[PDB]
Amino acid sequence: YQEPTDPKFPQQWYLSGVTQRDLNVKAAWAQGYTGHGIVVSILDDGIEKNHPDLAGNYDPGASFDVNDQDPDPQPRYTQMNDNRHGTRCAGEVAAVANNGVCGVGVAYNARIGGVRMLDGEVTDAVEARSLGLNPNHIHIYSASWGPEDDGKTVDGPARLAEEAFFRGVSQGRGGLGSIFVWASGNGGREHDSCNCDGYTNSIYTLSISSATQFGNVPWYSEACSSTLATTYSSGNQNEKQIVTTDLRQKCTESHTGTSASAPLAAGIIALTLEANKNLTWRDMQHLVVQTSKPAHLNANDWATNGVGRKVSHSYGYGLLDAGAMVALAQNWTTVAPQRKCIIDILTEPKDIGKRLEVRKTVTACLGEPNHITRLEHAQARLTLSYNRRGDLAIHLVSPMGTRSTLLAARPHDYSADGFNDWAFMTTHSWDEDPSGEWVLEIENTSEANNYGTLTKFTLVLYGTASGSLVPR
Numbered sequence: 001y002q003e004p005t006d007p008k009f010p011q012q013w014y015l016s017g018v019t020q021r022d023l024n025v026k027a028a029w030a031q032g033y034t035g036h037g038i039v040v041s042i043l044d045d046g047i048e049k050n051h052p053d054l055a056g057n058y059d060p061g062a063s064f065d066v067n068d069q070d071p072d073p074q075p076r077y078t079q080m081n082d083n084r085h086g087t088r089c090a091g092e093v094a095a096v097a098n099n100g101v102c103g104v105g106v107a108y109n110a111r112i113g114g115v116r117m118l119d120g121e122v123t124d125a126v127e128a129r130s131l132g133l134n135p136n137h138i139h140i141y142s143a144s145w146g147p148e149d150d151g152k153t154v155d156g157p158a159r160l161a162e163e164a165f166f167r168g169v170s171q172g173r174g175g176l177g178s179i180f181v182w183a184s185g186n187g188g189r190e191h192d193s194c195n196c197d198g199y200t201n202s203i204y205t206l207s208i209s210s211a212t213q214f215g216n217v218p219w220y221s222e223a224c225s226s227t228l229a230t231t232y233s234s235g236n237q238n239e240k241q242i243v244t245t246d247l248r249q250k251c252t253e254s255h256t257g258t259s260a261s262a263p264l265a266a267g268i269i270a271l272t273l274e275a276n277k278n279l280t281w282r283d284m285q286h287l288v289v290q291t292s293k294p295a296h297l298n299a300n301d302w303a304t305n306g307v308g309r310k311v312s313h314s315y316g317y318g319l320l321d322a323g324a325m326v327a328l329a330q331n332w333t334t335v336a337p338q339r340k341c342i343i344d345i346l347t348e349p350k351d352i353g354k355r356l357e358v359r360k361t362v363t364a365c366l367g368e369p370n371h372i373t374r375l376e377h378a379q380a381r382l383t384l385s386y387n388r389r390g391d392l393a394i395h396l397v398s399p400m401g402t403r404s405t406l407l408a409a410r411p412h413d414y415s416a417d418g419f420n421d422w423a424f425m426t427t428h429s430w431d432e433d434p435s436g437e438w439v440l441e442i443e444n445t446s447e448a449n450n451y452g453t454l455t456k457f458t459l460v461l462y463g464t465a466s467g468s469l470v471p472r
């Protein structure tokens with residue numbers, strides 16, 4: 001195998017690195033996987049389809065302009081170059097290789113499109129028509145947007161967008177399911193907690209966080225239990241950043257944030273789908289859980305779960321490993337159909353006060369078709385009132401002892417509106433047996449005399465009842 005000759009490929013340290021601090025993408029390229037036959041769409045502010053490093057891979061069938069209702073996602077050019085982001089993301093996935101221009105995409109032989117949908121009023125309908133674009137042609141969608149990262153918002157997809165997720169994973173891609181790759185958020189400076197973002201907190205999105213070049217949690221990172229894995233992005237001014245295509249037919253070395261991590265993940269997922277086109281949306285999440293690598297990512301919260309995998313709320317299961325993903329995909333056996341076990345926990349409302357603990361021993365639908373012995377996602381769907389929402393911290397402990405932070409204190413969240421059946425999600429108990437005692441902890445982290453009531457706690461388990469590996 002001959003590595004790319006593009007002039008900025010040596011600057012693509014997160015691909016071309018020879019020091020083991022990279023996404024192990026050359027190993028997938030050398031196995032023969034470059035994205036041939038896979039179609040990725042960037043849902044953002046448009047795509048410069050004539051960019052010299054994108055035109056060769058551009059796919060109009062992966063593209064649309066939802067803001068102006070036309071097929072052409074070309075960005076709106078302004079003095080401030082406001083609408084450059086989708087072009088930057090597109091080049092991360094699928095910039096052309098070996099053409100003397102800028103660098104390369106992770107999946108540099110994949111086809112790449114863009115939906116122009118952020119440059120206007122972004123309604124539920126706009127989101128839904130974007131997520132649902134051409135779902136039997138587009139394989140993978142990448143989205144680096146969502147509710148405001150102000151550290152005080154709790155919001156998620158409204159009805160049309162949630163319907164789009166369900167239709168995408170159910171009937172999209174020939175019934176295998178659209179793969180929705182999501183950036184987990186950029187609200188770190190505001191102490192944001194990403195389970196308060198219903199797009200990344202969804203089980204239907206494959207949520208990705210960032211690590212800096214030196215292996216640290218960047219300033220902009222949000223921790224939460226819904227994140228699945230990590231790719232490199234930007235950090236401090238001594239650390240390099242992401243190198244990609246830019247607006248006006250240029251090349252940038254300064255693409256940043258979790259917004260740059262999701263496209264890199266989408267590219268790795270494209271290589272993986274080339275290696276096994278029959279993978280379902282759930283298979284892909286299993287592959288990420290099994291192959292991602294904690295090594296040399298620094299965090300104070302690495303914990304071993306019940307099947308011996310290390311997990312962090314900053315990083316999920318760790319860095320994506322493209323070579324390991326494509327290798328494991330090739331002979332992967334499709335997972336069994338998804339089961340859903342609904343357990344309504346409370347028999348009475350519970351005062352929260354300073355601290356509340358709810359313990360319940362469950363059988364996980366023993367004796368029923370939805371019996372789960374192998375967990376995938378778990379949710380604690382909570383309905384509660386509280387006088388100052390951001391003083392709450394919430395944890396969920398699985399029977400195997402895995403402590404998931406469902407909500408960390410958010411100092412800017414002064415809301416008195418509480419949570420209305422909010423489905424806090426954790427990936428940290430993946431492959432555990434969920435039978436046994438679960439513990440929900442709700443704590444007032446402030447010295448104030450705060451008050452409220454938990455009125456509903458539904459534990460929702462997803463998973464199967466067959467096919468476990470020996471614990472790591």
Ligand SMILES: *[C@@H]1O[C@H](CO)[C@@H](O)[C@H](O)[C@H]1NC(C)=O
Pocket residue numbers: 278334
């Ligand atoms: C895809 O997987 C399904 C489920 O295991 C199987 O029935 C089908 O034959 C597979 N198709 C291909 C082309 O491998």
Ligand SMILES: NC1=NCc2ccccc21
Pocket residue numbers: 143144145146147148149183184185186197199200258259
């Ligand atoms: N998940 C996200 N919510 C807001 C946002 C901005 C940029 C990238 C990701 C997100």
Ligand SMILES: NC1=NCc2ccccc21
Pocket residue numbers: 118122145146147148155156
């Ligand atoms: N769903 C959304 N809330 C705020 C926002 C900004 C941009 C795109 C989508 C959203």
Ligand SMILES: NC1=NCc2ccccc21
Pocket residue numbers: 158159162163
């Ligand atoms: N998916 C949905 N979000 C809100 C809602 C109301 C009624 C039916 C479906 C939905």
Ligand SMILES: [Ca+2]
Pocket residue numbers: 065068070071072073074
């Ligand atoms: Ca247009």
Ligand SMILES: [Ca+2]
Pocket residue numbers: 006053095096097098099100101102103104
């Ligand atoms: Ca190039």
Ligand SMILES: [Ca+2]
Pocket residue numbers: 147148149150184185186187192193194197222
């Ligand atoms: Ca956020």
Ligand SMILES: [Cl-]
Pocket residue numbers: 340
């Ligand atoms: Cl469901």
Ligand code: NA
Pocket residue numbers: 155156157158
């Ligand atoms: Na919403």
Ligand code: NA
Pocket residue numbers: 182199200201202203204205206207226
């Ligand atoms: Na998600």
Ligand code: NA
Pocket residue numbers: 303304305306400401402
């Ligand atoms: Na443990």
Ligand code: NA
Pocket residue numbers: 399433434435436437
């Ligand atoms: Na058990």
